[PDB]
Ligand binder design. Sequence first.
Ligand SMILES: NC(=[NH2+])c1cc2nc(-c3cccc(-c4ccccc4)c3[O-])[nH]c2cc1Cl
Ligand SMILES: [Ca+2]
Length: 223
Amino acid sequence: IVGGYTCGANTVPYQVSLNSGYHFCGGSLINSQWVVSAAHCYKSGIQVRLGEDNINVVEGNEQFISASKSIVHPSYNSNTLNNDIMLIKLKSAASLNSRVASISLPTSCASAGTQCLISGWGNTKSSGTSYPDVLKCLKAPILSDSSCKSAYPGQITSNMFCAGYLEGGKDSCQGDSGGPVVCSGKLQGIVSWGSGCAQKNKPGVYTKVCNYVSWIKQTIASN
Ligand SMILES: NC(=[NH2+])c1cc2nc(-c3cccc(-c4ccccc4)c3[O-])[nH]c2cc1Cl
Ligand SMILES: [Ca+2]
């Protein structure tokens, strides 16, 4: 997260870190046994780390659980990143509490101008690589579809939306991918892609979760 702030330990209880010996992507807990992340964050050997703040220090509250299976969306396109969503089933259910809680799925899509909270342990520099130990937060609005398509002509599908600041300076970045975009307490987006981080007129693009609620529910119900 570039231009953001320290969230505060466990103030984002649904945030998870996907780990394979290092943190590579974020994700969101939606119930005690399933996490939603981005399809391009898929790899085998994933350990989901819940209740984290400093990802390099066991401070207490952490629960490390192995993924039993990862389900990348069948229509995920790695060249366009269209349908960039994946569900991860945990080997055992997590113990929920105030520090580890799930976030709700939306019932309707959000409108432009909605202010949302984006969080993660991704890079904090626009130019260079500086990864933080603790969780960073950023409040950012959903942009209009016309501004998004103007920024990324020909690359935005109806399963994506832009959020951020066109002036640059504040944005999500590498390492934040797969993590949550929460608006009014509902999970509306997943950190997906953008051109660089915090560049002027190049906002972040997020997977539009409201278009996948039936898919998520049906997939969880049959697995
Ligand atoms: N808001 C943005 N401008 C942005 C920049 C990103 N940059 C990345 C990114 C860059 C290189 C590698 C990865 C990566 C993907 C999968 C696994 C590990 C790293 C990224 O997510 N993801 C990004 C996601 C966003 Cl939304
Ligand atoms: Ca820790």
